[PDB]
Structures are given as structure tokens and as C-alpha cells.
Ligand binder design. Structure first.
Ligand SMILES: *[C@@H]1O[C@H](CO)[C@@H](O[C@@H]2O[C@H](CO)[C@@H](O[C@@H]3O[C@H](CO[C@H]4O[C@H](CO)[C@@H](O)[C@H](O)[C@@H]4O)[C@@H](O)[C@H](O[C@H]4O[C@H](CO)[C@@H](O)[C@H](O)[C@@H]4O)[C@@H]3O)[C@H](O)[C@H]2NC(C)=O)[C@H](O)[C@H]1NC(C)=O
Ligand SMILES: *[C@@H]1O[C@H](CO)[C@@H](O[C@@H]2O[C@H](CO)[C@@H](O[C@@H]3O[C@H](CO[C@H]4O[C@H](CO)[C@@H](O)[C@H](O)[C@@H]4O)[C@@H](O)[C@H](O[C@H]4O[C@H](CO)[C@@H](O)[C@H](O)[C@@H]4O)[C@@H]3O)[C@H](O)[C@H]2NC(C)=O)[C@H](O)[C@H]1NC(C)=O
Ligand SMILES: *[C@@H]1O[C@H](CO)[C@@H](O[C@@H]2O[C@H](CO)[C@@H](O[C@@H]3O[C@H](CO[C@H]4O[C@H](CO)[C@@H](O)[C@H](O)[C@@H]4O)[C@@H](O)[C@H](O[C@H]4O[C@H](CO)[C@@H](O)[C@H](O)[C@@H]4O)[C@@H]3O)[C@H](O)[C@H]2NC(C)=O)[C@H](O)[C@H]1NC(C)=O
Ligand SMILES: *[C@@H]1O[C@H](CO)[C@@H](O[C@@H]2O[C@H](CO)[C@@H](O[C@@H]3O[C@H](CO[C@H]4O[C@H](CO)[C@@H](O)[C@H](O)[C@@H]4O)[C@@H](O)[C@H](O[C@H]4O[C@H](CO)[C@@H](O)[C@H](O)[C@@H]4O)[C@@H]3O)[C@H](O)[C@H]2NC(C)=O)[C@H](O)[C@H]1NC(C)=O
Ligand SMILES: *[C@@H]1O[C@H](CO)[C@@H](O[C@@H]2O[C@H](CO)[C@@H](O[C@@H]3O[C@H](CO[C@H]4O[C@H](CO)[C@@H](O)[C@H](O)[C@@H]4O)[C@@H](O)[C@H](O[C@H]4O[C@H](CO)[C@@H](O)[C@H](O)[C@@H]4O)[C@@H]3O)[C@H](O)[C@H]2NC(C)=O)[C@H](O)[C@H]1NC(C)=O
Ligand SMILES: *[C@@H]1O[C@H](CO)[C@@H](O[C@@H]2O[C@H](CO)[C@@H](O)[C@H](O)[C@H]2NC(C)=O)[C@H](O)[C@H]1NC(C)=O
Ligand SMILES: *[C@@H]1O[C@H](CO)[C@@H](O[C@@H]2O[C@H](CO)[C@@H](O)[C@H](O)[C@H]2NC(C)=O)[C@H](O)[C@H]1NC(C)=O
Ligand SMILES: *[C@@H]1O[C@H](CO)[C@@H](O[C@@H]2O[C@H](CO)[C@@H](O)[C@H](O)[C@H]2NC(C)=O)[C@H](O)[C@H]1NC(C)=O
Ligand SMILES: *[C@@H]1O[C@H](CO)[C@@H](O[C@@H]2O[C@H](CO)[C@@H](O)[C@H](O)[C@H]2NC(C)=O)[C@H](O)[C@H]1NC(C)=O
Ligand SMILES: *[C@@H]1O[C@H](CO)[C@@H](O[C@@H]2O[C@H](CO)[C@@H](O)[C@H](O)[C@H]2NC(C)=O)[C@H](O)[C@H]1NC(C)=O
Ligand SMILES: *[C@@H]1O[C@H](CO)[C@@H](O)[C@H](O)[C@H]1NC(C)=O
Lengths: 414, 70, 98, 49, 49
């Protein structure tokens, strides 16, 4: 017959990092195998159309990268500008809004993030730039964040007007199971906790270096793959030498053809392996990008009831920040802290009828009986407005005997 | 011509972009929605005034403004 | 021939211990669980609170508790018997090994 | 050639198994530690436990 | 102008099975191809890495 009910709460902010895209690479098939040689080029035509297939596969990967970025970041086509009055009921948003005093319109946290990720042409290998520059990504993120902060639950519906921030916070408090008066009576403490958590995240980013391992792994894997592809160009494969010019300048065509054939087979195998593994890695990255888009649309533009989908605890808000080849989310949650013991009962018997609470639980502190809500302690008198009646007092296991008050009799007496 | 310098482009209405050398397009400074993507934020489209192809920097959308109150 | 199979990091006993701890915590702590300062919450109150989340009032559970428990126990026993008889339940796990 | 074929097919199968494991983790966190309102995500009917 | 409303209920329990992991395998490349032979081992170095 015991129950524990929190008597306090704290505001918590955590982070989450998701890869979105990877580097775009184009390769010349003939230049890699038979770079600047006519005998090798004429021998290559006997093998059909391998080069076209490899080029097509790489091109499809390159297109899919830009599709991933476009799906993740360009969700809303309205551009919202930074509010000129930084009054949000005491909430500090300076460390995540764009810095007007810098040439690069990045926030402080984005600047910190973009300084923690670090970092062969004549072999036919080229890297070509992405369609959206970093400034455009930052602008999309900034517009999204500013619109979410200022327009509240209106946002994309148009005809937007500045909705006060505390009203949004109260409305999202209501979606957890806590009444608005808690926020409206603890606003200053809530804002203080929020600001402290943001500062703590900033310091943690400024000190620790291993935060972005998820984003570093992709770069490392791609670089290693390219390095292996380049190094496979010095192998012998059973010929007399690994240089086409040498064998062309030394031997006659009839046997040069045989040894050039050996070299050609080796180079073709290397290219095939590289392309296949790139295809598999691209599939994995696409799955990650789909997850990121779902996360953005379900956590930044609304409240989520799914457990642990937006960090630990009860979800309140989340804000996006851009990172190299990725995105960072900042989840804000509600965490009850201080628990106390009480005695509880399932029903109250008053005059031959059983009473159940409309919302919450019946709670006892030793002598009196009250009714509260589960997530915050706020006792009040048990009346006929808090409860409803069903049946008699002989079926419920564990019923009590006292006592329901009527808020009408004093009025009728007077 | 991808990743090339126009001064000098021996392999080659001439404009040097961040994506390479572009030949046959006229440069403007009015932003629009992307029609044919080139790369590095540059987009191209043909429209009326006949057979004229233009190159411009991409636009991210229509600006929106709200009245600020409390 | 150069082929070796090497063991997993977590033994089966550790997996079973994790599962048991998870189940016991869920059963005893109710909606508190991971928040700490855990105290035994009565199970029937958890069942009533989850009945409320479907669209049914608590009095239904508090007036049909015994029948509900009987049905639950019968269903658990039926699952046990079905596992004890049928052999093709775990084809999903058998396919990977094959 | 034999070794190459074996390794490639193992890689693909590993990707599939990883997707299944992600589904299992989501199922655990959304059905064992809370109630789910998603239809047919936790069996047929209205989910209780 | 008709509607149907239940007058009873039943409790149902079902099962669901999900794979999580598979077997871990390590292979020696040279021992598979050129097991205990020096001529084969020296010929293998011509193929790179
Ligand atoms: C629910 O949980 C909240 C959250 O913790 C708690 O209520 C507040 O708890 C905080 C600490 O957790 C209290 O803060 C401390 O208050 C002490 C007394 O406050 C007086 O002195 C400060 C001095 O600046 C005045 O500003 C204030 O107006 C009061 O006159 C202070 O001694 C503490 O300050 C010292 O430590 C801080 C660092 O923590 C230093 O920066 C200071 O310089 C100084 O050295 C500290 O400020 C706070 O008073 C509590 N009440 C509030 C915010 O109203 C409880 O745990 C709980 N509340 C419940 C159950 O009601
Ligand atoms: C919540 O919002 C408020 C405004 O509403 C912010 O307050 C200002 O924040 C800025 C940015 O941090 C502060 O500017 C800083 O000034 C420092 C020098 O002055 C401070 O320190 C001296 C003591 O040396 C004090 O006497 C003085 O009063 C100030 O307190 C600079 O040194 C800082 O630059 C350093 O940090 C930045 C971090 O970005 C580095 O990039 C620099 O290279 C350098 O190392 C900085 O410019 C300003 O002082 C704050 N105002 C007040 C009144 O304190 C809060 O920062 C904001 N908080 C959060 C968590 O969002
Ligand atoms: C919660 O509240 C309810 C109602 O307020 C309580 O239920 C009553 O409990 C009292 C005891 O505290 C019961 O009183 C006793 O009833 C005995 C049975 O007689 C009644 O029941 C029969 C059933 O066949 C009827 O036919 C008959 O007409 C009566 O209505 C009596 O025999 C008892 O009398 C004896 O003991 C008393 C003790 O003082 C002596 O003075 C007498 O001389 C005699 O020796 C006694 O009167 C009462 O019947 C209960 N009501 C009902 C409706 O069941 C719960 O007990 C209470 N629970 C808690 C935990 O507080
Ligand atoms: C709900 O919870 C209750 C306890 O709160 C459980 O009740 C006991 O369960 C155990 C386990 O099944 C029972 O132990 C069994 O005893 C059998 C022998 O005694 C029974 O049978 C004779 C008739 O032969 C009766 O006279 C006697 O009263 C008992 O009913 C053993 O033979 C059993 O072992 C066999 O089954 C097990 C299954 O695990 C096999 O592993 C064995 O190899 C062997 O084949 C078993 O040990 C105990 O009897 C139950 N108590 C009572 C009072 O009946 C319920 O089982 C539990 N139900 C569910 C669905 O969870
Ligand atoms: C809503 O749905 C429920 C769920 O089915 C139903 O209400 C119950 O319905 C079941 C039948 O499905 C009833 O079970 C049967 O009850 C008969 C009468 O019960 C008396 O006899 C038993 C004998 O043990 C006593 O224990 C009991 O207390 C009563 O005095 C019994 O004859 C049946 O027992 C026979 O079959 C079982 C196997 O089913 C054997 O184990 C027995 O040994 C015996 O051979 C059986 O117990 C149950 O009684 C109903 N309960 C209630 C509260 O209604 C209805 O369909 C529906 N209820 C509504 C609308 O109110
Ligand atoms: C919850 O806390 C209360 C204290 O408020 C505990 O009450 C104690 O109960 C033990 C016996 O169980 C007594 O010996 C103590 O004197 C009680 N303390 C007080 C201050 O009254 C209660 O036990 C706790 N809950 C549980 C389930 O143990
Ligand atoms: C805790 O229980 C005590 C009784 O032991 C309550 O004290 C009385 O409460 C009533 C109404 O709440 C007041 O009218 C009395 O004046 C109180 N008496 C004393 C001596 O203070 C107390 O209210 C209970 N508190 C909670 C939060 O349940
Ligand atoms: C490619 O062209 C660019 C022009 O955008 C060159 O960059 C400048 O080139 C001029 C002369 O061509 C130099 O005086 C400047 O110092 C260069 N600026 C920078 C920042 O380097 C670039 O040098 C050309 N590259 C090659 C290989 O010719
Ligand atoms: C839009 O482009 C025109 C080019 O036709 C710009 O006109 C030139 O601008 C540069 C500096 O940006 C000057 O050095 C030239 O002398 C200008 N040429 C002429 C003929 O005026 C024009 O300035 C651009 N618009 C803006 C707002 O920068
Ligand atoms: C919302 O609309 C009301 C009117 O419907 C605006 O009230 C205007 O306020 C300005 C001063 O700020 C006055 O000059 C106008 O005369 C008012 N309009 C009317 C019809 O009286 C209100 O300003 C609008 N909201 C915001 C945030 O601007
Ligand atoms: C808005 O109203 C609040 C009081 O509700 C006041 O403190 C604040 O100064 C006002 N700001 C503006 C810009 O009107």
C-alpha cells in the first residue's frame, strides 16, 4: 500500500550526432588502368563495357549524396529572420542563434563543432564539390530554429504572429501530464536550469575531443579506401615491372601484349573491389540519413510520445545544429528528482458507494487523504468534483472508509 | 570544364565559377529557385531572349516577417 | 584450413541476467523504474493506469480483477504448452545459422 | 576468387542483421518501458504490457 | 442509425522473435591459399595487399 511521488524536477539537455552524407568521388577508368598509352588502350577495348558500368555506379552514388542532404535540411521553404528583441521570458538563446558580428553566420556551438573534425589526381581520381555550401546549410538550420522559436505551434501554417515563449512552454508542459501552474510559478528556476545546462554543453564541447567519432569514422574509412586503391597501382602481378613505359620501351609488342594483359587484369580487379565496397557503404549512409530526416520532422516540429526517441525522460523541445557531413540535435527533457513516501488506496467508500479519482491517485500522509497527480505533488481536498461513483463497497480489494466532501452544502445553507 | 582554370584552359561567354570553367552562359546577379544544378551553389536555366542560358546563385526561399509583441 | 570461430564478449548467463533485471524492475517499480528512489508500486495500480490509456475506466479492472488474472495465467500456460509441442517456432533464428 | 566471394556476401548479410538489431532495440525501448499507441506495433489489439 | 458496443473482453498473449547477431569468423588469408609452402608464399607477395 505504498507509493512514491516526486516533489521536484530538473531540466536536462543532451546531444545526438547523426551522419548524413559522404564525399563524392569520380574516377576515370581508362586513365587509371592504361594512363597515357595506346597499346594498353587498344587492348582494353577487348573487354567490352566495364568502364561504363563503373562510371555509372559512381555517378549514382554522387547523386544520392545530394539527395540525402536535400531531404534532411530543406524541409521548410519559408525564411524567418532573427528576432530583434531577445526577450523570451528569461531563456537565453544567444549561444545557438547566428552571430551577427562574424562573416560566417554561425552560432558559437556550430563554430566549435566545425573545428573538431579533421581534415593522386594524375591517377584519374577526382573529388567534386557538393551542391549546397556550408553557409546554405547554416542558413536553413537558422531559419528553422528561429521559426520554431517565434511561431510556436503556428509555424508553417502562414499568417504567423509572435506567440509568447512561456505560453509554448506551458502548452508543452501540459502534454507530459503536468498542469500549467507549475511552469507559471517556477518560471525563473526553470530558465536558470536551462541556461546552466546550455553552458555546460558548451564547456563540454570546448574541452572533450572525442565527441564526433561518429562523423570521424566515415572520413577515415573513405580515406583508407582511396589510399588502398592508389597503392594497388605499384604491384607487379607477375609481370617484369609495374611501369607501362618501361615495358613499352624495352620489349617487342608480341610479348608486351601478354604482360600488359596481366597488369590490366590486376588493375581491373582492384577497381571492381573499390566500387563494390563503396556501394555497400553508400547504402548504410542512406539509411542513416533517413533516420535523421525522421528525427528532424518528429522532434523539432512537434512533441514525441515515443519513449527514448528524443533522449532520456519526457520530451519537451529539441533544437538542430549543423555539423560537417551531419547534424546535431539538442534534446530538452523533464526529470523528476526528489521522491517521498505515502500510503495509497484504490478507492474511497463514503456512504455505501465507492469513489474513484477522475485523474491521479488517492494519497495519505498519515491522517488525512488527498488526491494528486502522479508526476508532481500537489495535494487537495477530496470532493465530489474530483471523483466519480460506481457500485458499492464490497467488490474492490483494499477500499478505505473516509471521506468525501460536498462543495454545495455551505451555499444551500446560506 | 570541371575543376579547371580559364587562364589558361588549353583544353577549351566565358566565366570562372567555383565548379570550373563555364562556356556559353550569361552571368546575372538575381537569385532564383534551382533548375539545373551545377555545383557549389550555382544553378542554371534557360528561359525568355531565345536560346539564352543564364547562370545564377541559388535562392533558399521567400522571406517572411512577423510582428513582434509580448 | 585457416578458419577460426571466436567467442562473443557477453556470455549467455550475462544476457539472461540483463533480461531478468529488466523484467523484475519493470514489474516492481511501475512507472518509476529508472528515475531512482524506487519503491514497490502495487501491480493492480499499474494495470489500472494502463487500462486508462486505452479508453477504459479503472473500475472495470478493479471489479473484474480475478477474471483478468485467470485469463492471463491461462494464456501464459497455453504459450508454454505450445512451445513444448511445436518445433518450427524458431525458423527465423534457424535460417541465419543454416 | 573464392575468398572474395565469401567476404562480399558476408558483408551484405551483416548489413541485414544490423537492420534487424536496430528494430529489436527500438521494440524493446518502446514496448517494454512504456505503452505504445502505434497500431500493430506490439501485436494485434490494444497494447498493455 | 445503428451501432455495436462490446459487452465483454479477453486478455491475449502472443510472441515475436527477432534476430540480433550472428557468428564471428576470422580467416587466415595466406594459410588458406598457400598453406605451408614457401614458393606459393613468395608468389603471393606479387599481388599487393
Ligand atoms: C527543489 O529543487 C530546487 C533546485 O535545487 C531547490 O530549491 C532551490 O535550490 C537551490 C539549490 O539547489 C537554492 O540555491 C541556493 O540558495 C541558498 C539560499 O538562497 C539565498 O541566498 C542566495 C545567494 O545568492 C540568494 O540569491 C537567494 O535569493 C537566497 O536569498 C544560497 O546559499 C545558495 O547560494 C550559494 O551557492 C551558489 C552556488 O550554488 C553560489 O553561486 C552563491 O554565491 C552562494 O555561495 C544557492 O543560491 C535555492 O535557494 C532554492 N530555492 C529557490 C530557487 O527558490 C530545492 O531543492 C527544491 N525546492 C523546494 C522543494 O521548494
Ligand atoms: C546569456 O545571455 C547573456 C546576454 O543576455 C550573455 O552575457 C554575455 O555573454 C558574452 C559572451 O560570453 C560575454 O562577453 C564576454 O566578455 C569577456 C570579457 O568580459 C567579461 O569578463 C570580465 C572579467 O575578465 C568581466 O569583468 C566582464 O564583466 C565580463 O563578464 C570576454 O573575455 C569573452 O570572450 C572570451 O570568450 C569567448 C567565448 O565565445 C571567446 O570566443 C573569446 O575568444 C574570449 O576567450 C566574451 O566576449 C558578456 O560579458 C556577457 N555579459 C555579461 C553581463 O556578463 C551570456 O553569455 C549568455 N549565457 C549563455 C549560457 O548563453
Ligand atoms: C468501513 O465502514 C463500514 C461501514 O461504516 C464498516 O462495516 C460495518 O462494520 C461494523 C463493525 O465495525 C458492523 O457492525 C457489526 O455488525 C455485526 C453484524 O450485524 C450486521 O450485519 C448483519 C449481516 O447479516 C445484519 O443482518 C445485521 O442487521 C447488522 O446490520 C453485529 O453483530 C455487530 O454487533 C455486535 O458487536 C457490537 C460491537 O460494538 C456490539 O455493540 C453489539 O452488541 C454486538 O455484540 C456490529 O454491529 C457493521 O455491520 C458493518 N456494516 C456493514 C454494512 O457491513 C466496516 O467495518 C469499516 N471498515 C473499516 C476497516 O473500518
Ligand atoms: C502458477 O503459480 C503456481 C504457484 O504459485 C504454480 O503451481 C505449482 O507449479 C509447479 C510447477 O509446475 C508444480 O510442480 C509440479 O509438480 C508435479 C507433481 O505434482 C503435481 O502433480 C500431482 C499429480 O501427479 C498432483 O497430485 C500434485 O498436487 C501436483 O499438482 C511435477 O510432476 C511437475 O514436474 C513436471 O513438470 C515440470 C514442468 O516444469 C517438468 O520440468 C518436470 O520434468 C515434470 O515433467 C512440477 O514440478 C506444482 O504442483 C504447482 N502447485 C500446485 C499447488 O499445483 C503454477 O504452476 C503456476 N502456473 C503458471 C501457469 O504459471
Ligand atoms: C464475459 O465473459 C466471461 C468470460 O468467459 C463470462 O463469464 C464467465 O464465463 C465462464 C464461461 O466462459 C464461466 O465459467 C464457467 O462457469 C460455470 C458456472 O460457474 C459455477 O460453477 C463453477 C464450477 O467450478 C464455480 O467455480 C463457479 O464459482 C460457479 O459457481 C461452470 O459450470 C464452469 O465450470 C465447468 O467448466 C470448467 C471449464 O470451463 C471446469 O474447469 C469446471 O470443473 C466445470 O466443469 C465454468 O467455470 C464463469 O463462471 C463466468 N464468470 C462470470 C463472473 O460471469 C461471460 O461470458 C461474460 N460475463 C458476463 C457477461 O457477465
Ligand atoms: C517510506 O518512508 C516512510 C517514512 O516516512 C517509512 O516509514 C517507516 O516505516 C518503518 C516500518 O516500515 C518504521 O519503523 C519507521 O518508523 C517509519 N518512519 C517514519 C518516519 O515514520 C516507510 O517504511 C517507507 N516505505 C517503505 C515501503 O518502507
Ligand atoms: C500531513 O498530515 C498532517 C496531520 O498529521 C496535516 O496537518 C493538518 O492538516 C489540516 C489540513 O491539511 C490542517 O487544517 C491542520 O491545521 C493541520 N494540523 C497541523 C498540526 O498542522 C497536514 O496538513 C498534512 N500535510 C499534507 C501535505 O498532507
Ligand atoms: C586558378 O585561377 C585562380 C583564379 O581564381 C588563381 O588564383 C589566383 O591567381 C592569380 C593569378 O592567376 C594569383 O595572382 C593569385 O594570387 C591567386 N589567388 C590565390 C588565392 O591563390 C589560381 O592561382 C589558379 N591556379 C593555377 C594552378 O593556375
Ligand atoms: C550585378 O552585376 C553587374 C554586372 O553587370 C554589376 O555591375 C558591375 O559591378 C562591379 C562590382 O560588383 C563593378 O566593378 C562594375 O563596374 C559594374 N559594371 C557596370 C556596367 O556597372 C552590379 O554591380 C551587380 N549588382 C550588385 C548589387 O552588385
Ligand atoms: C494584430 O492585429 C491588431 C489589430 O487587429 C493590431 O493592432 C494594431 O496595433 C497598432 C499599433 O501596434 C495600431 O496602430 C493599429 O491601429 C492596431 N489595429 C487595429 C485594427 O486597431 C496588432 O498590432 C496586431 N499584432 C501585432 C503583433 O502587431
Ligand atoms: C512585453 O510585456 C512584458 C510584460 O508582459 C514586459 O515586461 C515587456 O517589457 C514588454 N516588451 C515589449 C517589447 O513590449
Amino acid at each position: 500500500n505504498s507509493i512514491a511521488i516526486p516533489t521536484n524536477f530538473t531540466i536536462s539537455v543532451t546531444t545526438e550526432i547523426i551522419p548524413v552524407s559522404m564525399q563524392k568521388v569520380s574516377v576515370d577508368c581508362t586513365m587509371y588502368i592504361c594512363g597515357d598509352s595506346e597499346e594498353c588502350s587498344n587492348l582494353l577495348l577487348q573487354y567490352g563495357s566495364f568502364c561504363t558500368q563503373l562510371n555509372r555506379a559512381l555517378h549514382e552514388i554522387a547523386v544520392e549524396q545530394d539527395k540525402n542532404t536535400q531531404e534532411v535540411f530543406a524541409q521548410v521553404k519559408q525564411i524567418y529572420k532573427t528576432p530583434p528583441i531577445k526577450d523570451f521570458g528569461g531563456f537565453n538563446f544567444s549561444q545557438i542563434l547566428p552571430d551577427p558580428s562574424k562573416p560566417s553566420k554561425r552560432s558559437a556551438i556550430e563554430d566549435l563543432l566545425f573545428n573538431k573534425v579533421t581534415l593522386q589526381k594524375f591517377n584519374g581520381l577526382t573529388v567534386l564539390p557538393p551542391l549546397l555550401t556550408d553557409e546554405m546549410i547554416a542558413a536553413y538550420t537558422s531559419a528553422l530554429l528561429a521559426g520554431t522559436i517565434t511561431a510556436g505551434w503556428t509555424f508553417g501554417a502562414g499568417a504567423a504572429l509572435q506567440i509568447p515563449f512561456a505560453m509554448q512552454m506551458a502548452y508543452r508542459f501540459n502534454g507530459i501530464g503536468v498542469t500549467q501552474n507549475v511552469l507559471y510559478e517556477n518560471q525563473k528556476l526553470i530558465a536558470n536550469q536551462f541556461n546552466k545546462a546550455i553552458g555546460k554543453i558548451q564547456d563540454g564541447l570546448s574541452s572533450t575531443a572525442s565527441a564526433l567519432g561518429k562523423l570521424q569514422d566515415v572520413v577515415n574509412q573513405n580515406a583508407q579506401a582511396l589510399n588502398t586503391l592508389v597503392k594497388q597501382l605499384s604491384s607487379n602481378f607477375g609481370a617484369i615491372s609495374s611501369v607501362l613505359n618501361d615495358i613499352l620501351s624495352r620489349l617487342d609488342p608480341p610479348e608486351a601484349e601478354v604482360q600488359i594483359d596481366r597488369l590490366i587484369n590486376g588493375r581491373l580487379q582492384a577497381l571492381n573491389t573499390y566500387v563494390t565496397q563503396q556501394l555497400i557503404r553508400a547504402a548504410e549512409i542512406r539509411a542513416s540519413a533517413n533516420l535523421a530526416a525522421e528525427k528532424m520532422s518528429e522532434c523539432v516540429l512537434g512533441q514525441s510520445k515515443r519513449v527514448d526517441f528524443c533522449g532520456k525522460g519526457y520530451h519537451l523541445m529539441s533544437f538542430p545544429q549543423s555539423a560537417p557531413h551531419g547534424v546535431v540535435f539538442l534534446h530538452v527533457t523533464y526529470v523528476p528528482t526528489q521522491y517521498k513516501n505515502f500510503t495509497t488506496a484504490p478507492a474511497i467508500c463514503h456512504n455505501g458507494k465507492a469513489h474513484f479519482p477522475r485523474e491521479g491517485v488517492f494519497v495519505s500522509n498519515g491522517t488525512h487523504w488527498f488526491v494528486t497527480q502522479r508526476n508532481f505533488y500537489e495535494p487537495q481536498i477530496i470532493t465530489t468534483d474530483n471523483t466519480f461513483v460506481s457500485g458499492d463497497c464490497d467488490v474492490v480489494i483494499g477500499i478505505v472508509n473516509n471521506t468525501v466532501y460536498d462543495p454545495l452544502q455551505p451555499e444551500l445553507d446560506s | 570544364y570541371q575543376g579547371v582554370n580559364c587562364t589558361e584552359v588549353p583544353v577549351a561567354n566565358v566565366f570562372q565559377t567555383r565548379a570550373g570553367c563555364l562556356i556559353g552562359a550569361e552571368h546575372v546577379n538575381n537569385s532564383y529557385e534551382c533548375d539545373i544544378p551545377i555545383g557549389a551553389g550555382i544553378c542554371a536555366s534557360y528561359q525568355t531572349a531565345s536560346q539564352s542560358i543564364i547562370a545564377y546563385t541559388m535562392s533558399l526561399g521567400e522571406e517572411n516577417s512577423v510582428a513582434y509583441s509580448n
